[PDB]
């Protein structure tokens, strides 16, 4: 009764890319769905479920950077999108904003998922500044449309990738770092749903922290040794890639996983790190999992909303 069905939906080129790379990484008990106008992109997708939208509009090509085409394509394929989502308790929609299919279709996909009762999370990118103003303006319109259609939204400005690379870092490695935001969020929620805790949080706690909230932060931190709880908590909340930082969070789900050495003192330390960084009076849903396979490692999972 506890095993909520999670689906990750990539919409458009960048979304499809993220799905392919997450499948390559390995991720079980999550169903992947690839949605695109671009038939050739879908032919290369590794997702078990593929939905080609807008064939009568685009003749099987991509949207050619036109959000109107992405929106029309998704609206006309509503039933096929519904069929793929059916059964979902939680849907993550990922897309690169600024082109046509992601910008236009991802908000339609999210609205369909929300009206099917799924807890609906968007994780989307904004374009690099070097792509120019029209891409950014189109992306802004997509982001606003996404915000209206999801329960929670995580935006990754691609310009932040320029903050974490050196002059040689392969573009594909930078893209994998952006992928981690979505992948680790999904994994942390999957683990929370599946693993019974000593202070047990479940999918109903996820729904409470995320339903109808707007901006969100999802983070995981892992540390060991001295100060592990503080360091893990800091890692969970500190991503350089996020538009929405922890500052201003008024609601937090925090789950700590450790071995039998997990101390009460360090749990409070981790909670205090999150509360202080939010710089608000935070309402916390606190959970603890004891994994005796763990020795000195501690894992802190954070979901923050209420901005
Ligand atoms: N981090 C990241 N950003 C991407 C990727 N592909 C594309 N983008 C970005 O997503 C934007 C839209 O590209 P797209 O290929 O998704 C256009 P469409 O949705 O029409 O297919 C691009 O302008 C670019 O900013 C990607 O794999 N990783
Ligand atoms: K649980």
Numbering used by the authors: 9 to 315
What is the paper's account of this structure, in its own sentences?
FtsZ is an assembling GTPase that plays a key role during bacterial cell division. This widely conserved protein polymerizes in the presence of GTP and metal cations into polar filaments that gather at the center of dividing cells to form a dynamic Z-ring. We report a dozen filament structures of the FtsZ core (residues 12 to 316) from the pathogen S. aureus, hereafter SaFtsZ, in complex with various GTP mimetics and metal ions.
We also sought to solve the structure of SaFtsZ complexed to GMPCPP, as it induces filament formation with Mg2+.
